[PDB]
Amino acid sequence: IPSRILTRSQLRDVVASSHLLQSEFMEIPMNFVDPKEIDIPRHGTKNRYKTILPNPLSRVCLRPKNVTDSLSTYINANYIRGYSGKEKAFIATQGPMINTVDDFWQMVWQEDSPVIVMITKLKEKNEKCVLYWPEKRGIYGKVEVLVISVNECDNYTIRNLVLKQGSHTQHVKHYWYTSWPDHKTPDSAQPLLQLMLDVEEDRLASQGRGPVVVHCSAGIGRTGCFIATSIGCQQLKEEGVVDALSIVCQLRMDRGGMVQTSEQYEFVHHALCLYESRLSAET
Ligand SMILES: [Cl-]
Numbered sequence: 017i018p019s020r021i022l023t024r025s026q027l028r029d030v031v032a033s034s035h036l037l038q039s040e041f042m043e044i045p046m047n048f049v050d051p052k053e054i055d056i057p058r059h060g061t062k063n064r065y066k067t068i069l070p071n072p073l074s075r076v077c078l079r080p081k082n083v084t085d086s087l088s089t090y091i092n093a094n095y096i097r098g099y100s101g102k103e104k105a106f107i108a109t110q111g112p113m114i115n116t117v118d119d120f121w122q123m124v125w126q127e128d129s130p131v132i133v134m135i136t137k138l139k140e141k142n143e144k145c146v147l148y149w150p151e152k153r154g155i156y157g158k159v160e161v162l163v164i165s166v167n168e169c170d171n172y173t174i175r176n177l178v179l180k181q182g183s184h185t186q187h188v189k190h191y192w193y194t195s196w197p198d199h200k201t202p203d204s205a206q207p208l209l210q211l212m213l214d215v216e217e218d219r220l221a222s223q224g225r226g227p228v229v230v231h232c233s234a235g236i237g238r239t240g241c242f243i244a245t246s247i248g249c250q251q252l253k254e255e256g257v258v259d260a261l262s263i264v265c266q267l268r269m270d271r272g273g274m275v276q277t278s279e280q281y282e283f284v285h286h287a288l289c290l291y292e293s294r295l296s297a298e299t
Pocket residue numbers: 153154155
């Protein structure tokens with residue numbers, strides 16, 4: 017409905033057009049939820065930022081057994097639609113807090129997520145996220161996580177996890193991208209593209225499985241960047257064009273505030289541009 021479809025040429029020009037991207041970004045409403053829309057007493061206790069809340073229509077509802085309260089189903093996390101409106105392509109969530117780590121893993125388990133993408137240091141001046149995974153093994157509520165391997169890459173490290181409950185096992189790839197500046201976007205999109213492409217290969221290898229879980233700290237800025245880029249590169253690949261405006265608007269339909277700043281919005285364009293240079297000539 018808010019639309020601005022860009023051809024590959026158009027996309028390549030708009031990178032050197034920050035002025036226009038700022039006002040284009042500024043024309044997209046944040047879609048932050050009214051606190052009164054959420055009717056879950058004490059949901060605040062499970063939120064890292066008190067005004068960054070999950071839109072209720074798309075919130076990830078934990079499925080614990082033998083509790084009667086709505087708070088027991090609450091996690092600050094939303095399902096995010098993918099390319100073509102693909103339901104549950106992603107979950108955008110906040111950095112787990114000390115009191116929400118078991119909740120987090122309940123979500124990863126119950127949704128059958130194959131990949132976690134973590135785009136935050138634990139501390140960046142402030143505490144941004146808690147250490148929620150073990151060195152070898154840890155038990156998080158009903159979910160046991162085992163570290164099978166660690167893989168070091170240029171721009172991120174991977175833990176290869178399995179989650180276990182009883183007889184059941186689920187593999188989870190956990191990516192940790194730590195080099196994103198406190199308040200600036202990275203100077204190069206290559207590292208984030210590399211991550212996007214590795215994760216894209218994991219999704220193709222994970223047919224029928226659940227959403228890729230993406231988070232940073234509030235789970236909208238960097239997380240929105242990663243997801244907007246993932247989908248927009250997918251539109252670039254399939255259609256030869258990209259509607260980054262539309263993408264960000266739909267993302268905000270899923271979770272208020274996705275792609276938080278205009279600098280992030282521009283950075284998504286840098287990434288989409290970088291992706292485009294690797295595509296086969298247009299036709
Ligand atoms: Cl343990």
